[PDB]
Amino acid sequence: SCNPSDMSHGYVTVKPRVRLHFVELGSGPAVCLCHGFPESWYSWRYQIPALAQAGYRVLAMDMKGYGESSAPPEIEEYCMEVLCKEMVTFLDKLGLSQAVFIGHDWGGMLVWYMALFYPERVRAVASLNTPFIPANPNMSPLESIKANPVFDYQLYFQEPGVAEAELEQNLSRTFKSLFRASDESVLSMHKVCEAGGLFVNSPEEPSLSRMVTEEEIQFYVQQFKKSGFRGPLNWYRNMERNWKWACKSLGRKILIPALMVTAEKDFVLVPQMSQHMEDWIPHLKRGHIEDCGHWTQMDKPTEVNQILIKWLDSDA
Amino acid sequence: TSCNPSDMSHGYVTVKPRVRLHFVELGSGPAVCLCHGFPESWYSWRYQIPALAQAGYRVLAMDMKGYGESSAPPEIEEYCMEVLCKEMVTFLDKLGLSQAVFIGHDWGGMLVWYMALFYPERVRAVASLNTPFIPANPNMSPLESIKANPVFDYQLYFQEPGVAEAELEQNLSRTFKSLFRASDESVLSMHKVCEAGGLFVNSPEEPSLSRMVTEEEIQFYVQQFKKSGFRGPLNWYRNMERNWKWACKSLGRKILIPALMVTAEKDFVLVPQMSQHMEDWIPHLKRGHIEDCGHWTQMDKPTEVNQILIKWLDSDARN
Numbered sequence: 001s002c003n004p005s006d007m008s009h010g011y012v013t014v015k016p017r018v019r020l021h022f023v024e025l026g027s028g029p030a031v032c033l034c035h036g037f038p039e040s041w042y043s044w045r046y047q048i049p050a051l052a053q054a055g056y057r058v059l060a061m062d063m064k065g066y067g068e069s070s071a072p073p074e075i076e077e078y079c080m081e082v083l084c085k086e087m088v089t090f091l092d093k094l095g096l097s098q099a100v101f102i103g104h105d106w107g108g109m110l111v112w113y114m115a116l117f118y119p120e121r122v123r124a125v126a127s128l129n130t131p132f133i134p135a136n137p138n139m140s141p142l143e144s145i146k147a148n149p150v151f152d153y154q155l156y157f158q159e160p161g162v163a164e165a166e167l168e169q170n171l172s173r174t175f176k177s178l179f180r181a182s183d184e185s186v187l188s189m190h191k192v193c194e195a196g197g198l199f200v201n202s203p204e205e206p207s208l209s210r211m212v213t214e215e216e217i218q219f220y221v222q223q224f225k226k227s228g229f230r231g232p233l234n235w236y237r238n239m240e241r242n243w244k245w246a247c248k249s250l251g252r253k254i255l256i257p258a259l260m261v262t263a264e265k266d267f268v269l270v271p272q273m274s275q276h277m278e279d280w281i282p283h284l285k286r287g288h289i290e291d292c293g294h295w296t297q298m299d300k301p302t303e304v305n306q307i308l309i310k311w312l313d314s315d316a
Numbered sequence: 317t318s319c320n321p322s323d324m325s326h327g328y329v330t331v332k333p334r335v336r337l338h339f340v341e342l343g344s345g346p347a348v349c350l351c352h353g354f355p356e357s358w359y360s361w362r363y364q365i366p367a368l369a370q371a372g373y374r375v376l377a378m379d380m381k382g383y384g385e386s387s388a389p390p391e392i393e394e395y396c397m398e399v400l401c402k403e404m405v406t407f408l409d410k411l412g413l414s415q416a417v418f419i420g421h422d423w424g425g426m427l428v429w430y431m432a433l434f435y436p437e438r439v440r441a442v443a444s445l446n447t448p449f450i451p452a453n454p455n456m457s458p459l460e461s462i463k464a465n466p467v468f469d470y471q472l473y474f475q476e477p478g479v480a481e482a483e484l485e486q487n488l489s490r491t492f493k494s495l496f497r498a499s500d501e502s503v504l505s506m507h508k509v510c511e512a513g514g515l516f517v518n519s520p521e522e523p524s525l526s527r528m529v530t531e532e533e534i535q536f537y538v539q540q541f542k543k544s545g546f547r548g549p550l551n552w553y554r555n556m557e558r559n560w561k562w563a564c565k566s567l568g569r570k571i572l573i574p575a576l577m578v579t580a581e582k583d584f585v586l587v588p589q590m591s592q593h594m595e596d597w598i599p600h601l602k603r604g605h606i607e608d609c610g611h612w613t614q615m616d617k618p619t620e621v622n623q624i625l626i627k628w629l630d631s632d633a634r635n
């Protein structure tokens with residue numbers, strides 16, 4: 001619902017050789033959109049103009065590792081704690097005392113941690129698909145993962161270099177293979193690690209999902225030539241550090257306004273994984289989108305737009 | 317904020333194929349767009365940026381076309397007011413701003429009066445430092461007005477492409493140290509620049525530092541001007557007839573939006589007197605006046621500028 005050369009582009013240095021890029025549209029309260037793996041500010045293309053038109057100032061991030069943002073190679077550059085402190089510095093250098101934070105997938109994880117540890121800087125928090133679950137102090141992090149078969153792909157992502165080689169091999173194939181409606185899926189996150197890697201049993205020349213044009217796919221291809229998949233995959237490589245930081249939050253509740261949006265056909269981030277979030281956030285507002293897979297903003301833009309705007313205009 | 321550039325959000329908006337505008341951005345609230353003069357930088361607003369942000373405003377401090385990190389195309393016609401204003405509208409469009417408050421100084425002040433005139437739907441409110449709004453006289457030219465006022469002789473020396481460039485670019489530290497002074501510290505005569513050779517021919521080789529500026533501040537302007545030099549900044553001065561014709565096409569419509577005129581007692585070229593009948597053409601005009609203030613108003617009297625702009629913004633443009 002836009003093209004890049006028609007956007008205002010913003011750059012903030014959050015530490016010496018680390019700068020975050022964002023796209024900025026609209027006037028009103030600051031709304032900070034944080035994309036997932038492996039995405040772009042561009043994943044918000046349907047939300048950016050709608051939220052601006054509804055009276056919001058939209059900052060659509062390239063998250064660290066993506067697009068025009070720095071992509072340092074070290075795994076530890078991408079633990080939640082480093083990523084949240086940088087976002088705080090991002091607000092500081094822009095002179096925002098607060099923003100609304102809206103995240104999807106890994107961006108959803110970031111915004112929950114922001115709301116947990118930096119509630120004074122977060123006006124309101126909304127997650128697409130990604131639930132908030134307080135740290136389970138004697139469930140081995142690695143035990144949770146191999147206790148859910150559909151998280152098998154995450155194991156394949158651990159070894160530095162392997163998923164990079166496969167994902168970077170044919171970028172147009174990577175994005176055409178990932179960015180599909182759930183009824184169009186050509187992937188099985190079930191048996192990734194033992195059945196080769198990710199694309200071994202899937203088309204060499206995948207068709208175009210009903211969700212995406214060729215132009216849209218070529219935009220993600222062009223972005224991922226800058227730094228490739230190392231930075232993005234490093235979001236998946238901080239599980240123990242992430243758990244240990246979450247543990248340090250112990251009792252504390254999210255007292256700020258909060259929205260959780262579930263997607264019926266996300267088979268990895270299943271709606272049921274949110275089911276007891278009221279126990280830890282009782283005010284939490286909820287949305288639910290039918291016939292919506294993992295790529296929520298791209299799959300059901302109309303539904304996402306109506307749920308975010310309604311919620312933005314009412315709670316915070 | 318103030319001092320440090322790498323401590324700020326930097327924004328870039330492509331307004332046409334060969335032209336992208338750079339700005340620094342600080343704060344939440346109503347958009348306030350600050351437009352510097354000749355030969356300056358977003359950095360001339362270094363004292364206003366954190367003050368306006370702390371007062372509840374979203375500050376966009378422009379590198380104007382020809383300056384800093386903004387596009388500086390070499391053609392004179394790229395710097396007439398009509399092209400510069402149309403580009404500032406495109407700038408608002410691509411940022412998704414229906415309106416902004418525009419605050420200008422010197423050539424920037426000129427730009428914001430013309431925005432207020434031709435694009436009032438896009439201008440929430442307009443404030444000029446030093447630069448008056450005088451409606452176009454259909455009978456006399458700029459050339460006749462200029463010649464009449466001896467203190468505009470520097471403007472004549474500026475018209476010949478290459479000349480004022482060569483002198484101004486020769487020693488950038490000397491240029492800025494010579495330009496950026498309080499009125500009582502002036503080492504320049506704008507009286508006969510033309511006959512007396514050029515601008516610095518009878519002024520110190522190694523000028524002292526003005527009480528207004530540090531060595532570091534000067535080095536900032538020097539570094540910015542190494543990229544594109546003075547050609548684009550000087551082109552602002554080389555569109556008098558195009559600007560006059562454009563202004564005439566107003567046909568004496570009024571500026572009906574809220575407006576602030578700030579005068580500087582010791583600005584000896586943009587004299588307070590030049591503003592004296594601006595009410596006739598601007599119904600909602602408020603005034604500020606700064607004593608012991610030369611041309612470089614933001615630098616000279618930051619405290620007084622900050623209080624006048626914040627007071628006016630908080631009364632006549634929401635907050």
Ligand SMILES: C=C(C)[C@H](CC=C(C)C)Cc1c(O)cc(OC)c2c1O[C@H](c1ccc(O)cc1O)CC2=O
Pocket residue numbers: 105106108109130131132133134135136145151154235236237238239240242243246269273
């Ligand atoms: C289903 C979820 C809520 C998490 C995964 C969600 C997305 C992939 C966006 C679970 C999960 C992983 O499966 C893999 C991980 O590290 C490779 C992590 C992860 O979440 C961990 C976590 C545990 C407890 C807690 O309170 C917060 C957490 O983020 C940490 C982690 O990095």
Ligand SMILES: C=C(C)[C@H](CC=C(C)C)Cc1c(O)cc(OC)c2c1O[C@H](c1ccc(O)cc1O)CC2=O
Pocket residue numbers: 422423424426447448450451452453458462468471552553554555556557559560563586590
């Ligand atoms: C109002 C003023 C005192 C102007 C000077 C102001 C600054 C140098 C910031 C006068 C002036 C010049 O001296 C030189 C110029 O073109 C080289 C111009 C200029 O203003 C002209 C102008 C006249 C009438 C009008 O209604 C609008 C105008 O912009 C145009 C011009 O470029």
